[PDB]
Design a protein around this ligand. Structure first.
Ligand code: A1BOM
Ligand code: ZN
Length: 140
């Protein structure tokens, strides 16, 4: 689990969104596994606006923050799970690192701020849903 709180927005994995998030929906995309809902309080996270390919992510299944090199956002085949059938997920970045299903929501960050959240993994890989192209997260 986990979320990004920027301005009056909450960014979560679409598959983990709550009733309140769907009721206060701003934008969602099943193909990206992302959902953004509105909040009443101001968040404190800053979204990175960059092309960084190195960063640090939080892995809840190890209580550890791991430095990683990750690929640029791309369309990647993702195996079937309890939440989606096997499909291509877009804007996904992969890295070699540990992840378990409940690690989704862990933040990946670089020197410029939040890059994305854990969204996929298995077999020694970890995949992150990119948020850096969502420019509107920084305004209104
Ligand atoms: C971090 O993900 C994993 C880690 C180890 C094993 C399996 C997984 C994948 C997983 O369970 N899901 C849920 C839905 C999500 C998606 N974005 O399609 C992927
Ligand atoms: Zn960066």
């Amino acid at each position: 689990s986990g979320a990004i709180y920027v301005g009056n927005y909450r960014v979560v994995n679409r598959h983990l969104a709550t009733h309140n998030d769907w009721a206060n929906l701003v934008w969602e995309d099943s193909s990206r596994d992302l959902l953004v809902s509105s909040t009443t309080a101001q968040g404190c996270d800053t979204i990175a606006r960059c092309d960084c390919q190195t960063g640090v992510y939080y892995c809840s299944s190890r209580r550890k923050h791991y430095p990683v090199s990750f690929s640029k956002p791309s369309l990647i085949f993702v195996e079937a799970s309890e939440y989606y059938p096997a499909r291509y997920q877009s804007h996904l970045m992969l890295a070699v690192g540990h992840s378990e299903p409940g690690d989704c929501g862990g933040i990946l960050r670089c020197q410029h701020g939040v890059v994305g959240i854990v969204s996929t993994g298995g077999n020694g890989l970890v995949g992150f849903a990119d948020v850096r192209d969502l420019l509107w997260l920084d305004e209104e």
